[PDB]
Enzyme design. Structure first.
Site, PDB file in Angstrom:
ATOM      1  CD  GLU A 146      -4.450   4.850   0.652  1.00 21.53           C
ATOM      2  OE1 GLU A 146      -4.030   4.477   1.773  1.00 21.53           O
ATOM      3  OE2 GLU A 146      -5.633   5.161   0.414  1.00 21.53           O
TER       4      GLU A 146
ATOM      5  CG  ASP B  55      -8.245   9.440 -24.949  1.00 17.89           C
ATOM      6  OD1 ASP B  55      -7.291   8.622 -25.081  1.00 17.89           O
ATOM      7  OD2 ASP B  55      -9.288   9.141 -24.352  1.00 17.89           O
TER       8      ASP B  55
ATOM      9  CE  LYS C 137      -7.484   1.520 -26.316  1.00 16.23           C
ATOM     10  NZ  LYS C 137      -7.282   1.781 -24.876  1.00 16.23           N
TER      11      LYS C 137
ATOM     12  NE  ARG D  27      -7.461  -4.216 -19.943  1.00  5.12           N
ATOM     13  CZ  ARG D  27      -7.709  -4.343 -21.243  1.00  5.12           C
ATOM     14  NH1 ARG D  27      -7.118  -5.277 -21.987  1.00  5.12           N
ATOM     15  NH2 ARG D  27      -8.578  -3.523 -21.806  1.00  5.12           N
TER      16      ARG D  27
ATOM     17  CE1 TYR E 171      -4.411   0.905  -0.126  1.00 10.70           C
ATOM     18  CE2 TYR E 171      -4.511  -1.325   0.751  1.00 10.70           C
ATOM     19  CZ  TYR E 171      -5.135  -0.260   0.135  1.00 10.70           C
ATOM     20  OH  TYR E 171      -6.453  -0.343  -0.237  1.00 10.70           O
TER      21      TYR E 171
ATOM     22  CB  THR F  77      -4.959   3.015 -22.654  1.00 15.22           C
ATOM     23  OG1 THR F  77      -4.919   2.901 -24.086  1.00 15.22           O
ATOM     24  CG2 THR F  77      -6.322   3.441 -22.204  1.00 15.22           C
TER      25      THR F  77
END
Ligand SMILES: Cc1[nH]nc2c1[C@](c1cc(-c3ccc(S(=O)(=O)N(C)CC(F)(F)F)cc3)cc(C(F)(F)F)c1)(C(C)C)C(C#N)=C(N)O2
Ligand SMILES: Cc1[nH]nc2c1[C@](c1cc(-c3ccc(S(=O)(=O)N(C)CC(F)(F)F)cc3)cc(C(F)(F)F)c1)(C(C)C)C(C#N)=C(N)O2
Ligand SMILES: Cc1ncc(COP(=O)(O)O)c(CNCC(=O)O)c1O
Ligand SMILES: Cc1ncc(COP(=O)(O)O)c(CNCC(=O)O)c1O
Ligand SMILES: [Cl-]
Lengths: 442, 442
Positions: free
Chosen positions: B56, B208, B237, B243, B54, B234
């Site tokens: 954060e 984008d 692709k 991902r 973790y 992203t």
């Protein structure tokens, strides 16, 4: 036309650090209540070619084809989820697409109330998550306090949920959702009384059980599925799964909610699901249902009890003076040292814990406690007996945090100067490393 | 206290399906524009123990300690991001936390305009993504049309962005953001003319470039970094990463946007980052900057051209009659078959493509096209010469889709009944399989 050279050869720079990370994790006493260690099987799924596939939509209602095997994996994961949490698939539905806890709670809150909608949650300082509508005066910190209109209830002076004040606020505020289940709350929840209050106002009952998920599954704590309209959990904490989240919804209590929830996740918020996540969850959700995991989850509470008891035996105060679950919050006020300082001290000796507010802390600038939990160390094979030593090491870290504050002062800048080279920390770190390094490590 | 048995033993049920998935992937001609095949190095990172942690917050401003090795990975990933896309770390910043494309665009859009804010995007039917403010009359389909107020611009009758209409709408609507870069747009973008329009109304320029990211990186297409305030992409692709998603922000053009964006990602929307994703991205962003990847990206376009050309030689129509990038959209109107029907036909022969709208489709219920792309097949080593066969297979699939529509009718229910057992599909499937099965496979 690709480079298939192993990770060590392709990118030696990265591999060194990941191998360093592996060592620190192996050599740390990890008391982070939200952390755990994944098994290999879960990590094989996370590294599978199933994450090459775009499968926007739900199973049998996919946008693209070639998603037959993906459909089986998503269906198997929803089944195992409903099984594991002891609900019939007629009465309870589940979405396995949320990429994490914060996304699931926003998605679920949106579905129920929409933009501008009214929500009630436990305050952050008092144990609630950010995605329970947290805000400051200074800013609307979470989207949940901005895209929704939110009100925040507190825990009383003794560190318990104050149901009277929940009703005071819920009757005047008339919310459409009330959230319960928390990030750093050491006691069980009266879901029945929450359900009672929501009916009285007509509100939805939302239970976020991310931290206590295995207790609910294993019938060791109160079952929110008997009372709640929506239940959310992450899959990576005490459940010991990958980084993802589950949204449960009570079809029987509210028909049409299935579509509301499913449409909120996709296409309101997310796009393509992450199938490796979904597959990894499947692999853990099998393991959840086996009686060996109930054995594990029991060990988590047994360790948590023995850890609370030993800390008390060494005259350390705990919020609510004990625990019903996997986590303890230490009240450090009698030593006049912050959680800020003790986290730095525990970092220096390879002990992962985090600073945490206590009811007496009005503001979150300098919290007066630390939160600890047993899921992670239990996974590495530690029994009740082993908690005395963790208690010992924490006591010694507290004592050295007092010493260093007397020597360098109350400011955190000055305090940290004392840590590098301090003979006792090196001594202690090494004890930590010798014992931790040798423990079972998935 | 954990089960370390390998995936095959622990859960043979799941492993079978994942092994099936691996076979179909190996045996398919995958023309999904948005898909690719991860190398093993990316998948080793996706399965690392680094996802146990973790962390954060941002690097050197972490809520919990013990994040020194995680700090190096996040820093290293942001560096390679800025390097790879040819921007100096002084002029451009980047957030590597977004879990996926849809989350990055919502996060970025919130940062800039906030709740109730105004945004402009390309309509979904014309090539926009859902997160570009997509809505229908029937509902606010994407949160981007609900938490924001959105207006949607269309491409003209000939399948091109109509800049006159963008300005007609941008001066009347007076938005704070204008989004460009698209899901199924086969031509390059005039970012300069977008920059011109946005200045005129005082709007932010949002690019984008998820579908064309490698083209931007390698200086094969227009560089939106010269004109844009925010660039999202992203990573899964044409970039060939895991991902995840990246948000880029122009510090120089708007100071105080670094915090605006960073605070939108956390804690406005997300909680714990997924470090395995970040590590995976690091490993791919190394590869992006190597000249071998420029060779790859060039081959994607070479293949896309040769594929457009061959489809034309067989009297098949393309939207805008060609491609500047990795993707083609086929106009099937001259054959009176829907993309709906052709997708099912291509599925039956192990060819993954998806149905797509064309300018003439007023509503998106039944699209008159299919979108294809070359990234995935190029990764498996296919050259210009091999595109004639893909063109051959697709024509043959189109022809059989006509045959079966005449025989069973125009209803999709009735149509599908013809597919199982059809001799030519079986003949063609086996040709597809014999050629695909043998191609290099990471
Ligand atoms: C990081 C995090 N996520 N969810 C949590 C937390 C906890 C938390 C959040 C916070 C927290 C406090 C403030 C913000 S903030 O408002 O966005 N921001 C950074 C402060 C500002 F505005 F900049 F001054 C964000 C997170 C602080 C603490 C502590 F450091 F004060 F102790 C603890 C811990 C588990 C870490 C928490 C508590 N206590 C609770 N209940 O739940
Ligand atoms: C799945 C997806 N995500 N992002 C996309 C798409 C695409 C898409 C989205 C959609 C799409 C259309 C409508 C919805 S919807 O409004 O949420 N919903 C399911 C319909 C309703 F209203 F609920 F009944 C959701 C997705 C449809 C198509 C097609 F079937 F018409 F061809 C295609 C493709 C890449 C698949 C698309 C196009 N064309 C564009 N531009 O972008
Ligand atoms: C009740 C609750 N809900 C949601 C989350 C956030 O989930 P993601 O990190 O997967 O978004 C947390 C963990 N918050 C910090 C902690 O307890 O360690 C939580 O405690
Ligand atoms: C331009 C664009 N932006 C964002 C996204 C969202 O990505 P996630 O799936 O990671 O949320 C997509 C996905 N488009 C689907 C496709 O073209 O296949 C996209 O095309
Ligand atoms: Cl992942």
């Amino acid at each position: 036309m690709f480079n298939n050279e192993p990770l060590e050869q392709i990118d030696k720079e990265l591999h060194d650090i990941l191998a360093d990370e592996e060592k620190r994790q192996r050599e740390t006493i990890n008391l982070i209540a939200s952390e755990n260690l994944t098994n290999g099987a879960v990590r094989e799924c996370l590294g599978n070619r199933v994450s090459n596939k775009y499968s926007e939509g739900y199973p049998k209602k996919r946008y693209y084809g070639g998603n037959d095997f993906i459909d089986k994996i998503e269906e198997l994961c929803q089944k195992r989820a409903l099984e594991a949490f002891n609900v019939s698939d007629e009465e309870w539905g589940v979405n396995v697409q949320p990429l994490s806890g914060s996304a699931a709670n926003v998605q679920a809150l949106y579905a129920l109330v929409g933009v501008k909608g009214k929500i009630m949650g436990m305050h952050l300082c008092s144990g609630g998550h950010l995605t329970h509508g947290f805000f400051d005066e200074k800013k609307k910190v979470s989207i949940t306090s901005d895209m929704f209109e939110s009100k925040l209830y507190k825990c009383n002076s003794q560190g318990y949920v104050d149901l009277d004040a929940v009703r005071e606020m819920a009757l005047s505020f008339k919310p459409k959702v009330i959230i319960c289940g928390y990030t750093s709350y050491p006691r069980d929840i009266d879901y029945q009384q929450f359900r009672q209050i929501c009916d009285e106002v007509n509100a939805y009952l939302f239970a976020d059980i991310s931290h206590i998920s295995s207790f609910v599954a294993c019938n060791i704590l109160n079952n929110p599925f008997l009372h709640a309209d929506v239940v959310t959990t992450t899959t990576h904490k005490i459940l010991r799964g990958p980084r993802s989240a589950l949204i449960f919804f009570n079809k029987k209590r509210n028909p049409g909610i299935e579509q509301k929830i499913n449409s909120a996740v996709f296409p309101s918020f997310q796009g393509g699901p992450h199938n490796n996540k979904i597959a990894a969850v499947a692999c853990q959700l099998k393991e959840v249902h086996s009686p060996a995991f109930k054995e594990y989850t029991q060990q988590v509470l047994l360790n948590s009890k023995a850890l609370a008891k030993a800390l008390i035996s060494k005259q350390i105060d705990l919020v609510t003076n004990g625990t019903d679950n996997h986590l303890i919050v230490v009240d450090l006020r009698k030593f006049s040292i912050t959680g800020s300082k003790l986290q730095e001290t525990c970092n220096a000796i390879n002990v992962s814990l985090n600073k945490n507010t206590i009811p007496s802390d009005v503001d979150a600038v300098s919290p007066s406690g630390v939160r600890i939990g047993t899921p992670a160390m239990t996974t590495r094979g530690a029994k009740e007996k082993d908690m005395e030593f963790i208690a010992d090491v924490l006591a010694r870290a507290i004592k050295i945090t007092v010493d260093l504050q007397e020597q360098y002062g109350k400011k955190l800048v000055d305090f940290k100067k004392g840590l590098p080279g301090n003979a006792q920390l090196q001594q202690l770190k090494q004890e930590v490393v010798t014992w931790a390094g040798a423990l079972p490590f998935p």
